[PDB]
Amino acid sequence: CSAGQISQTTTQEPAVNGVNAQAGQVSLRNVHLRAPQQTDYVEPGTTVELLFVAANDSTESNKLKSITSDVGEVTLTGDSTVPADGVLIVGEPDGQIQAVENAEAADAVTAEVELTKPITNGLLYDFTFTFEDGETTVAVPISAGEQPRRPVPPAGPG
Amino acid sequence: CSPPGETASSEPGTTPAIWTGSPSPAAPSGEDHGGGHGAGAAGAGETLTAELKT
Amino acid sequence: QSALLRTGKQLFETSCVSCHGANLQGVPDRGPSLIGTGEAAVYFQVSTGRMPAMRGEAQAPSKPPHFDESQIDALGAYVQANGGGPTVPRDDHGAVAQESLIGGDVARGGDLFRLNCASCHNFTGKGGALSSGKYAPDLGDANPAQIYTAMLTGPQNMPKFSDRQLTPDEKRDIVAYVRESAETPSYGGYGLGGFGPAPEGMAMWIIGMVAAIGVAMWIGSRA
Ligand SMILES: CC(C)=CCC/C(C)=C/CC/C(C)=C/CC/C(C)=C/CC/C(C)=C/CC/C(C)=C/CC/C(C)=C/CC/C(C)=C/CC/C(C)=C/CC1=C(C)C(=O)c2ccccc2C1=O
Ligand SMILES: CCCCCCCCCCCCCCCC(=O)O[C@H](COC(=O)CCCCCCC[C@@H](C)CCCCCCCCC)COP(=O)(O)O[C@H]1[C@H](O)[C@H](O)[C@H](O)[C@@H](O)[C@@H]1O
Ligand code: HEC
Ligand code: HEC
Ligand SMILES: CCCCCCCCCCCCCCCC(=O)OC[C@H](C)OC(=O)CCCCCCCC[C@@H](C)CCCCCCCC
Ligand SMILES: *C(=O)CCCCCCCCCCCCCCC
Numbered sequence: 001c002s003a004g005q006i007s008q009t010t011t012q013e014p015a016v017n018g019v020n021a022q023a024g025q026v027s028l029r030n031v032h033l034r035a036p037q038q039t040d041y042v043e044p045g046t047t048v049e050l051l052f053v054a055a056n057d058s059t060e061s062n063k064l065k066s067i068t069s070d071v072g073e074v075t076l077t078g079d080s081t082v083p084a085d086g087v088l089i090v091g092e093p094d095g096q097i098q099a100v101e102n103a104e105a106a107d108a109v110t111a112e113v114e115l116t117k118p119i120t121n122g123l124l125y126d127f128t129f130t131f132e133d134g135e136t137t138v139a140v141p142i143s144a145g146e147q148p149r150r151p152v153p154p155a156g157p158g
Numbered sequence: 159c160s161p162p163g164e165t166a167s168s169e170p171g172t173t174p175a176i177w178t179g180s181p182s183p184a185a186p187s188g189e190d191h192g193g194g195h196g197a198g199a200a201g202a203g204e205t206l207t208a209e210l211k212t
Numbered sequence: 213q214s215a216l217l218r219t220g221k222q223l224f225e226t227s228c229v230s231c232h233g234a235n236l237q238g239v240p241d242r243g244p245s246l247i248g249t250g251e252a253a254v255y256f257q258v259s260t261g262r263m264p265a266m267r268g269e270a271q272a273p274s275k276p277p278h279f280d281e282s283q284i285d286a287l288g289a290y291v292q293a294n295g296g297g298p299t300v301p302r303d304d305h306g307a308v309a310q311e312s313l314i315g316g317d318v319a320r321g322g323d324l325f326r327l328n329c330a331s332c333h334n335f336t337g338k339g340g341a342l343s344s345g346k347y348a349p350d351l352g353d354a355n356p357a358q359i360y361t362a363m364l365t366g367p368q369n370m371p372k373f374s375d376r377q378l379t380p381d382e383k384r385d386i387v388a389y390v391r392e393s394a395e396t397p398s399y400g401g402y403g404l405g406g407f408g409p410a411p412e413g414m415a416m417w418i419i420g421m422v423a424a425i426g427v428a429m430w431i432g433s434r435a
Contacts, residue, residue, distance in 0.1 A: 016248030030248030096296030
């Protein structure tokens with residue numbers, strides 16, 4: 001009776017770095033920050049990108065995506081009202097394929113944030129995604145999409 | 159019985175500060191030499207850089 | 213590719229939209245969202261066959277794949293385009309790499325396997341048990357691409373080994389060790405499975421002890 005109403009397989013989040021925020025009609029999937037850090041912190045004043053996918057649940061739509069801004073002044077370049085029983089893919093997560101030579105509306109709604117606050121990988125930073133339906137804090141992580149190991153200096157025994 | 163100390167739900171906590179390791183004291187006093195030089199002054203050593211900007 | 217994306221979408225729409233809802237978002241309490249899973253996850257999971265899954269239980273078992281390599285690639289490309297994420301390795305031609313994933317070093321691969329893989333699988337990649345109905349399966353069926361993608365995307369209750377955590381060279385070494393341990397003949401006779409104490413004790417008690425008792429019954433006289 002591992003197959004009962006509470007089963008391990010069904011109640012599993014995706015094995016992805018981005019968090020999931022189902023609150024609100026539009027569901028946020030694989031929401032993370034591309035913020036390549038060269039040191040302990042990503043210093044304020046540097047622009048890091050905000051990846052996620054906004055999937056519409058209802059066909060009756062919530063395609064506004066008004067502000068979705070928090071501490072950092074997230075700006076949505078190439079903003080569009082995409083979600084209509086479909087996906088709004090703000091950016092290009094590492095490994096993303098354009099899927100066609102051309103493109104629609106230039107960039108596909110790329111979200112970029114001027115930090116105004118140090119951030120580091122491993123921490124969770126709250127972002128308030130607000131559609132016309134409602135607002136939800138998501139606690140976005142920092143994800144190193146596909147970058148390999150940065151060479152750490154060799155150690156001199158002492 | 160159960161372990162005396164467990165289950166502290168309250169006090170959510172805080173993010174650890176950036177670690178600032180203290181230098182090794184006389185115990186592990188060994189450290190890398192910063193550069194040997196004559197140093198006929200207060201001391202500069204065998205290491206000195208500079209950036210000429212515009 | 214356009215046609216590859218279209219084929220992946222058509223397969224997705226008539227295979228999994230009931231549990232990975234259309235738009236790749238996950239159906240609450242039926243399946244996780246596939247945004248960000250990537251092409252490697254799709255390749256491993258569908259090729260091992262786990263994904264045409266017909267039950268929600270402790271663990272999704274392996275099974276014959278429901279799609280051929282071309283359809284696996286189509287589904288993987290569709291999922292990668294929708295979400296974007298890790299990609300399965302490929303060789304010079306374009307096919308999923310099998311021999312290229314055999315790392316040169318096998319001692320290093322074995323050390324890494326013992327530190328990370330044997331934790332649950334086995335000393336030599338036989339299966340292992342887990343908490344509640346789960347289990348780490350035997351690795352002898354997996355091919356190098358399947359092992360590499362299994363590490364790349366933690367399939368289920370398995371830690372996700374990123375390239376940063378296990379550089380592709382380390383993963384190639386682990387793949388080499390897995391294949392070598394799986395394809396290596398047991399020196400010293402029939403390795404009874406791969407578990408020493410339990411299969412060895414059963415074989416003692418059944419083969420050696422029944423032989424000894426039967427010989428004793430032959431020699432002696434019932435009374
Ligand atoms: C703590 C504890 C014992 C918990 C319960 C776990 C347990 C032993 C459960 C039973 C295992 C079984 C019998 C599973 C099949 C499903 C099941 C329960 C069916 C109903 C049982 C039933 C009433 C059937 C009708 C008649 C009946 C009693 C049939 C029993 C059938 C069997 C399996 C008989 C032989 C007993 C047997 C092999 C038990 C498993 C125990 C061990 C330690 C096997 C060792 C062993 C292993 C594990 C290898 O992998 C291996 C690989 C390569 C070479 C050799 C071996 C080897 O010897
Ligand atoms: C009486 C004295 C005689 C003793 C038996 C001696 C037999 C000698 C055999 C010949 C020489 C040694 C061959 C060694 C080559 C070799 O090892 O043999 C394997 C086979 O293995 C199996 O499957 C088992 C096949 C079934 C036949 C053997 C069964 C004998 C058992 C019953 C003896 C013990 C008694 C226990 C009693 C049980 C009842 C208790 C109530 C075959 O390869 P494979 O099958 O592919 O192994 C997989 C890797 O590949 C793959 O990666 C790996 O991942 C694995 O999957 C691995 O299995
Ligand atoms: C218990 C933690 C765990 C560790 C750590 C782990 N595995 Fe796994 N592994 C599993 C589980 C559980 C599965 C089954 C996943 C599924 O069926 O969806 C699995 C699946 C696999 C498979 C698929 C085999 C098949 O035929 O489907 C391979 C190959 C594999 N693991 C090898 C590895 C490698 C290589 C590593 C690198 C160290 C590793 N394991 C580390 C638990 C683990
Ligand atoms: C409920 C039946 C079921 C169907 C049918 C199904 N999936 Fe899934 N899927 C799941 C479950 C449950 C998980 C997570 C647990 C697991 O994988 O065992 C999952 C996870 C996945 C993963 C891995 C996610 C991760 O984070 O590693 C991929 C890739 C995937 N599904 C793709 C597919 C594809 C492609 C198909 C159709 C070819 C499909 N699934 C059909 C239920 C299903
Ligand atoms: C006192 C000893 C005698 C028994 C006394 C009366 C014993 C009376 C036993 C009532 C049992 C009531 C169970 C209530 C279920 C529950 O609420 O929990 C749900 C759980 C989550 O579901 C499960 O996980 C599995 C549940 C199914 C059990 C399959 C057992 C099959 C047995 C076979 C393996 C054959 C064994 C051979 C057995 C051979 C015996 C044949 C009779
Ligand atoms: C998951 O591991 C099993 C799910 C099965 C749940 C329903 C069980 C029905 C009852 C079966 C009766 C068994 C025999 C009773 C002996 C007295």
